[PDB]
Amino acid sequence: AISRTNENDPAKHGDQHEGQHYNISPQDLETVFPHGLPPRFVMQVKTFSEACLMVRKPALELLHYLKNTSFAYPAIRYLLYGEKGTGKTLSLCHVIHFCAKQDWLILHIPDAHLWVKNCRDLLQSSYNKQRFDQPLEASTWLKNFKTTNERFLNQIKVQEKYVWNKRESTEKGSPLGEVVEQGITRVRNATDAVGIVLKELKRQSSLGMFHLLVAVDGINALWGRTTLKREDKSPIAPEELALVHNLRKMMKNDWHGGAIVSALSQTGSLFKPRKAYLPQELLGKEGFDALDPFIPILVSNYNPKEFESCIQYYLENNWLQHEKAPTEEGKKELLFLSNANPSLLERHCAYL
Amino acid sequence: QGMAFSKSEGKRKTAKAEAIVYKHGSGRIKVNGIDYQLYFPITQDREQLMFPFHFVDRLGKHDVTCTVSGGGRSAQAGAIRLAMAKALCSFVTEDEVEWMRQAGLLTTDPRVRERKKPGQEGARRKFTWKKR
Amino acid sequence: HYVDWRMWRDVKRRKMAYEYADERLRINSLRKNTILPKILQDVADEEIAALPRDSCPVRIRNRCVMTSRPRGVKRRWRLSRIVFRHLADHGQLSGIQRATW
Amino acid sequence: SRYSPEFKDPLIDKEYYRKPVEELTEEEKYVRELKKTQLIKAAPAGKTSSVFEDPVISKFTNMMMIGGNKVLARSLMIQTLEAVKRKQFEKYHAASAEEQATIERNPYTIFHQALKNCEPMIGLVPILKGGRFYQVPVPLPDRRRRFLAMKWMITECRDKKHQRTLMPEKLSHKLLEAFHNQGPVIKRKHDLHKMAEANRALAHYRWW
Amino acid sequence: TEADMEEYIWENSSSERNILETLLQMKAAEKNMEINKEELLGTKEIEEYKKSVVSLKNEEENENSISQYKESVKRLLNVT
Amino acid sequence: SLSEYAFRMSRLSARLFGEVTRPTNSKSMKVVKLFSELPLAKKKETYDWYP
Numbered sequence: 037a038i039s040r041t042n043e044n045d046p047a048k049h050g051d052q053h054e055g056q057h058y059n060i061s062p063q064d065l066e067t068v069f070p071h072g073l074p075p076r077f078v079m080q081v082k083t084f085s086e087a088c089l090m091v092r093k094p095a096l097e098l099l100h101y102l103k104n105t106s107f108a109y110p111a112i113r114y115l116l117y118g119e120k121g122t123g124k125t126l127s128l129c130h131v132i133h134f135c136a137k138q139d140w141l142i143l144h145i146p147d148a149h150l151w152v153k154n155c156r157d158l159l160q161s162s163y164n165k166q167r168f169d170q171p172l173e174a175s176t177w178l179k180n181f182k183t184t185n186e187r188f189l190n191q192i193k194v195q196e197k198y199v200w201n202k203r204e205s206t207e208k209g210s211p212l213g214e215v216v217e218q219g220i221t222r223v224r225n226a227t228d229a230v231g232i233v234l235k236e237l238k239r240q241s242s243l244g245m246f247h248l249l250v251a252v253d254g255i256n257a258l259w260g261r262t263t264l265k266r267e268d269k270s271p272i273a274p275e276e277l278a279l280v281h282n283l284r285k286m287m288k289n290d291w292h293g294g295a296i297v298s299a300l301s302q303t304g305s306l307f308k309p310r311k312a313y314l315p316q317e318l319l320g321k322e323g324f325d326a327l328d329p330f331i332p333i334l335v336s337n338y339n340p341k342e343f344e345s346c347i348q349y350y351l352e353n354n355w356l357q358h359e360k361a362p363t364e365e366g367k368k369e370l371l372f373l374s375n376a377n378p379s380l381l382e383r384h385c386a387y388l
Numbered sequence: 389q390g391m392a393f394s395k396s397e398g399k400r401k402t403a404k405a406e407a408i409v410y411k412h413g414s415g416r417i418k419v420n421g422i423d424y425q426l427y428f429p430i431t432q433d434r435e436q437l438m439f440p441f442h443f444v445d446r447l448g449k450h451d452v453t454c455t456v457s458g459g460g461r462s463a464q465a466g467a468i469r470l471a472m473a474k475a476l477c478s479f480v481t482e483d484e485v486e487w488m489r490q491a492g493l494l495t496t497d498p499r500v501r502e503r504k505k506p507g508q509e510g511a512r513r514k515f516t517w518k519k520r
Numbered sequence: 521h522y523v524d525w526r527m528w529r530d531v532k533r534r535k536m537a538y539e540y541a542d543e544r545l546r547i548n549s550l551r552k553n554t555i556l557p558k559i560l561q562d563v564a565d566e567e568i569a570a571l572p573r574d575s576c577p578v579r580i581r582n583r584c585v586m587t588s589r590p591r592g593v594k595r596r597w598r599l600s601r602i603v604f605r606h607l608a609d610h611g612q613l614s615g616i617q618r619a620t621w
Numbered sequence: 622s623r624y625s626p627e628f629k630d631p632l633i634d635k636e637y638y639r640k641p642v643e644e645l646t647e648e649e650k651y652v653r654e655l656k657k658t659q660l661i662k663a664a665p666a667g668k669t670s671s672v673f674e675d676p677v678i679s680k681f682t683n684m685m686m687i688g689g690n691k692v693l694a695r696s697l698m699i700q701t702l703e704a705v706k707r708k709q710f711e712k713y714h715a716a717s718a719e720e721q722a723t724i725e726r727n728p729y730t731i732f733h734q735a736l737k738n739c740e741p742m743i744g745l746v747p748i749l750k751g752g753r754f755y756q757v758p759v760p761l762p763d764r765r766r767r768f769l770a771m772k773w774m775i776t777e778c779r780d781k782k783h784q785r786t787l788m789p790e791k792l793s794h795k796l797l798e799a800f801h802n803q804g805p806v807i808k809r810k811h812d813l814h815k816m817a818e819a820n821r822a823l824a825h826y827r828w829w
Numbered sequence: 830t831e832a833d834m835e836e837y838i839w840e841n842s843s844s845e846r847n848i849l850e851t852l853l854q855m856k857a858a859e860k861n862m863e864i865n866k867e868e869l870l871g872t873k874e875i876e877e878y879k880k881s882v883v884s885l886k887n888e889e890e891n892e893n894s895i896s897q898y899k900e901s902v903k904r905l906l907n908v909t
Numbered sequence: 910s911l912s913e914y915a916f917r918m919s920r921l922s923a924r925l926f927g928e929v930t931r932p933t934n935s936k937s938m939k940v941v942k943l944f945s946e947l948p949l950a951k952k953k954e955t956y957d958w959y960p
């Protein structure tokens with residue numbers, strides 16, 4: 037238990053815990069993370085039968101900022117950046133666990149690149165004929181949003197009347213669960229249900245009803261290019277997509293009562309070179325202008341202490357099965373091949 | 389700054405590398421100004437970079453700065469391996485240098501692409517032969 | 521005194537094409553654009569078609585200047601492969617050697 | 622070859638060189654002095670001194686490589702090794718303490734043992750006698766037994782019977798079956814043995 | 830237009846507009862009625878922020894340029 | 910896909926350096942290519958091909 041910590045409350049993590057793995061309870065995994073976790077980390081949780089996250093400085097710094105957030109001031113945009121596989125996504129997940137355990141409303145977009153590529157059913161929006169709806173993407177997110185924030189969905193009540201069809205319409209004063217359920221049940225109305233959910237939460241957080249965390253991973257997708265093409269085969273632009281148009285509005289710092297934590301990702305990005313990782317290189321001019329002012333937070337490769345704890349955690353679970361891995365000579369090779377990169381180390385240790 | 393270093397050269401196929409090995413370091417390697425795990429995403433290439441230092445059991449004790457031009461990813465890694473090994477000979481003992489030579493780490497690989505000859509499909513590949 | 525009647529026919533084609541090159545260039549310019557009226561471009565289409573057939577540059581053939589061979593000619597020397605090799609193998613072409621590598 | 626006959630193959634063994642001089646015998650000492658005067662070939666770009674280097678898996682990866690695409694071949698091998706490890710971990714976690722002891726979770730031990738189980742002890746060679754071709758039981762060299770096991774396993778995974786199944790899943794499934802002395806590849810070994818025992822009376826046809 | 834300009838000028842830029850708006854909302858949250866454009870944009874902190882943004886927009890983006898921009902924004906937003 | 914400033918600067922440079930100033934499609938640009946070079950029949954290699 038050298039690599040593990042007994043403090044499982046993300047609100048009590050400090051610098052003493054750097055390098056130690058804290059256990060996320062199975063209940064939190066089902067509720068707080070129906071979809072946020074990286075795909076290969078989800079495999080580890082299945083194989084090890086436990087979700088343990090290393091307390092690192094990038095999250096510790098960003099948890100400190102969120103503990104001292106002035107809810108009166110406009111929401112601050114925190115941007116996690118760093119090289120490929122350094123731990124940006126799992127740093128964002130550590131923070132989401134903190135805010136989720138403090139009864140914040142979580143608006144977690146697991147990957148914004150999925151909204152700008154590989155769309156089979158791009159339907160023209162009825163609310164605005166110049167914008168396109170993404171029924172499958174909206175419905176998928178709505179189901180998970182319902183799971184994470186089921187507790188609050190009854191308390192939050194819409195403050196307007198929303199006309200779905202000629203026949204159906206949501207009335208003022210009904211719970212927000214109804215809007216979420218309509219989008220889930222009727223998938224043609226899912227994109228508009230997401231727009232309303234985002235519109236209602238932004239307004240009602242400023243009124244002081246709840247604290248809203250906007251956790252968008254892969255945010256650089258919003259101001260980039262799309263691979264979605266019209267019927268005439270002309271390239272569609274991100275602004276025309278309804279889900280992107282509505283999420284962009286959440287990114288502006290014109291509301292208060294919460295924080296906006298985002299993470300960059302070149303993985304899954306469109307029209308970006310492999311080694312692009314700095315904010316302006318990935319966000320672009322339009323993206324940087326939208327987020328400016330923001331607080332960049334660097335995520336780096338494991339430091340010597342962190343690297344040792346990661347190997348100890350794998351050894352404690354018996355994941356490293358090669359007879360030379362536990363030895364000092366093996367560890368030196370593990371370090372050189374990855375260079376302390378968390379993702380390369382996990383991928384190399386997966387078959388040893 | 390008074391830090392000992394040894395420049396060397398290597399060659400593999402059409403690639404040519406120049407490696408500066410510092411007597412003391414932390415194990416940092418920079419290829420064309422880029423960290424080696426970024427410049428060499430393929431694991432096989434990084435394994436070749438580790439072969440010289442591992443064989444003499446000096447991983448993490450030297451800082452290397454190399455520049456490689458020409459060839460492909462594998463040829464560049466092979467060229468850098470030769471450049472690093474020859475430069476690192478300055479800091480290892482004479483006996484260790486002999487072991488490096490006997491392990492294949494100090495020989496320039498002469499295997500280069502063979503030309504294509506006229507009347508044939510390839511360097512050795514012949515056109516289909518028809519007895520009748 | 522040209523190598524054969526075929527060379528002599530190509531000699532006349534190269535001469536007639538040279539004489540008509542300017543007139544053909546001027547008329548083609550009228551045709552090779554979308555600016556001028558199609559009525560004018562149609563008259564130019566007829567005018568260039570009425571010029572003698574042997575003024576058309578596509579009818580010129582690069583024959584070997586020594587033997588009149590219509591194919592296998594190297595354009596830099598204007599010689600057929602058989603005649604070029606005869607001069608090269610005897611060391612009579614400056615700087616040309618057998619290639620081995 | 623671009624190497625002259627004088628060039629010798631490199632010996633990429635760290636432990637060999639570190640061996641103290643006292644351990645070395647008189648003949649072993651001569652071998653070291655001779656090598657100092659001999660030209661050595663450049664080490665190939667495949668094998669290194671890493672402690673994680675396994676020759677059998679290296680050979681298997683090369684036997685799966687198509688058109689020089691070693692990156693894809695190495696990718697498939699590591700995906701297979703991870704698949705075997707993950708499957709065994711699931712079986713271990715779902716097993717009782719007594720059963721858990723006997724469950725092997727090392728993907729390299731399973732790979733070696735599975736291939737060893739598939740190695741044929743005896744072979745058949747076609748021989749022509751009196752205008753007829755006979756399959757005569759013969760002893761097989763050690764190199765040919767190991768190659769046959771690897772070739773049989775790879776051929777089974779490449780068969781059309783498997784429909785839209787990726788190679789890491791196919792190979793991991795086949796390897797675990799052979800590790801337990803089951804599956805088609807083991808049947809191929811048994812068929813060779815049973816076809817050679819039936820032709821035991823033709824063993825005298827062999828002249829070597 | 831600003832697209833044509835080959836040199837980024839912080840004046841009349843989105844950065845100037847965005848930081849001004851953020852600072853005005855912050856003053857309103859404190860219930861301070863000092864909303865003078867000139868005073869807000871004349872502070873030393875704004876000068877550090879202007880310098881950082883111009884460097885990022887006109888020179889090669891590196892780790893050091895993003896750290897300087899980080900510290901300038903943290904001071905203007907009262908993040909410690 | 911050009912700004913008014915970029916378009917007018919490109920047209921000034923074209924006037925300065927002697928390039929086509931009016932908007933011209935690729936088909937009509939052949940007229941410029943036709944009169945900027947000698948016709949193939951007028952090149953010495955062509956009409957003086959034979960001795």
Ligand SMILES: Nc1ncnc2c1ncn2[C@@H]1O[C@H](COP(=O)(O)OP(=O)(O)OP(=O)(O)O)[C@@H](O)[C@H]1O
Nearest residue numbers: 074090120121122123124125126301303378379382
């Ligand atoms: N804090 C952490 N605790 C435990 N494992 C971690 C942590 N950070 C990273 N890892 C390991 O590294 C892998 C990569 O993490 P993550 O997906 O967060 O990286 P990333 O930098 O967001 O990647 P990308 O640049 O591709 O978006 C994880 O799957 C996990 O195995």
Ligand SMILES: Nc1nc2c(ncn2[C@@H]2O[C@H](COP(=O)(O)OP(=O)(O)O)[C@@H](O)[C@H]2O)c(=O)[nH]1
Nearest residue numbers: 163197198199200227228230231232235278282
């Ligand atoms: N179907 C439907 N969708 C609505 C309605 N009101 C808002 N929305 C959706 O919610 C989003 C946010 O609302 P709003 O701020 O009015 O959007 P805007 O008009 O595009 O600026 C819109 O883009 C729509 O997708 C409504 O009455 N009906």
Ligand SMILES: [Mg+2]
Nearest residue numbers: 124125300301
């Ligand atoms: Mg990520």
Ligand SMILES: [Mg+2]
Nearest residue numbers: 509510511513
């Ligand atoms: Mg070939």
Ligand SMILES: [Mg+2]
Nearest residue numbers: 578579580581
């Ligand atoms: Mg012709």
